[PDB]
DNA sequence: CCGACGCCGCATCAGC
DNA sequence: GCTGATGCGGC
DNA sequence: GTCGG
């Protein structure tokens, strides 16, 4: 947090971009310059010793520029007295409301969380999940609780067949001290890229957890993707836990790999591992790393037995998941 | 200057 | 019903 | 908004 000033900055900005403006890469380009500024191990101490990192051009320079000499910066002062754009940018906190349902919403007059409850005959029905679990999705999950969690999901996981391997990514694996949401990479040798030998693989194991009070409600559900929401079990006249949102993801086993390492991100890693891949022409998804030819066309799968193989086609060195916390 | 910017599952809608 | 585009959130 | 070619 040397430069959490400079970083908190950057990142409400592209959050404007992405909400208020629908302008992604401009949020994108935001987001890597925070990220890289958040890397970056001295104080930043002018714009044009930032100017020198990769992602950081003339116009975020002079911001911070701005941001040092005055603690403040003009554009984003003015955007937060902005009463549509502040009601925008708060209607997307909510799960399944993004820039343009809440554009839509503020356009109709709803505006604030209590228009939200009045109108939820308006929401689909993420919006009403992300709605009735609002206050509980901001907070953050302790390591503590999210250990807790991972023991639910593996045991109910192994009671329903001992052969599923069952394995937690996002910020968890990247040793997180505490996480936004619980994410579980599935796999069952029945699922492989070659065939699929039994049906209704995750519906199983999410109703096991639904069957047990593990998982309470359902975003989205497919063959391969399951969105949801858990609740550790809390004893008697204790207060209950927070609801959480947890991500499902059966992968087929033979692309545990190439899924683990996605699923382990960070999202700022990913994007950068991936825009790497296509310099050194490769192209990544959670399921392969393919050769892009001549006409950059994906090739097919290259063999890959480890996370590290993939870093070793591109020509990163290793990064354990602690360090891809970017 | 200028194109290119990671890649994708699910829910929902338009158009047939 | 399907297919294709769009919104959204996932890392 | 940034950047490589
Ligand atoms: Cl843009
Ligand atoms: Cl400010
Ligand atoms: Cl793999
Ligand atoms: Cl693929
Ligand atoms: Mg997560
Ligand atoms: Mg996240
Ligand atoms: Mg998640
Ligand atoms: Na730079
Ligand atoms: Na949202």
């Given at each position: ?68 000499a005055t603690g403040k910066l003009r554009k984003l002062e003015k955007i937060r007295q902005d009463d ?78 001992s052969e599923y391997i069952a394995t937690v990514c996002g910020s968890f694996r990247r040793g997180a ?70 991500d499902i993801r059966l992968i087929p086993k033979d692309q545990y790999y190439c899924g683990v390492l ?65």
């Amino acid at each position: 947090t040397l430069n959490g000033g400079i970083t908190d900055m950057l990142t409400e900005l592209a959050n404007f971009e992405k909400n208020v403006s629908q302008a992604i890469h401009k949020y994108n380009a935001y987001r890597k310059a925070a990220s890289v500024i958040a890397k970056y191990p001295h104080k930043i101490k002018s714009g044009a010793e930032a100017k020198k990192l990769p992602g950081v051009g003339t116009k975020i320079a002079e911001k911070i520029d701005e941001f040092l000499a005055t603690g403040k910066l003009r554009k984003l002062e003015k955007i937060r007295q902005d009463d549509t754009s502040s009601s925008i940018n708060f209607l997307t906190r909510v799960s399944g409301i993004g820039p343009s349902a809440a554009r839509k919403f503020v356009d109709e007059g709803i505006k604030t969380l209590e228009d939200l409850r009045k109108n939820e005959d308006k929401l689909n029905h993420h919006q009403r999940i992300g709605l009735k679990y609002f206050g509980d999705f901001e907070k953050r999950i302790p390591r503590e609780e999210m250990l807790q969690m991972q023991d639910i999901v593996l045991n109910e996981v192994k009671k329903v067949d001992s052969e599923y391997i069952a394995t937690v990514c996002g910020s968890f694996r990247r040793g997180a001290e505490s996480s936004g949401d619980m994410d579980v990479l599935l796999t069952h040798p029945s699922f492989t890229s070659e065939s699929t030998k039994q049906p209704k693989l995750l519906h199983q194991v999410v109703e096991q957890l639904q069957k047990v009070h593990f998982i309470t409600d359902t975003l989205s559900k497919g063959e391969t993707k399951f969105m949801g929401v858990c609740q550790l079990p809390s004893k008697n006249d204790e207060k209950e836990y927070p609801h959480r949102r947890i991500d499902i993801r059966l992968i087929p086993k033979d692309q545990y790999y190439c899924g683990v390492l996605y699923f382990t991100g960070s999202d700022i890693f990913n994007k950068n591992m991936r825009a790497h891949a296509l310099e050194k022409g490769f192209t990544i998804n959670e399921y392969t790393i393919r050769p892009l030819g001549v006409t950059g066309v994906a090739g097919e799968p290259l063999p890959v037995d480890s996370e590290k193989d993939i870093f070793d086609y591109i020509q990163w060195k290793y990064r354990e998941p602690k360090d891809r916390s970017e």
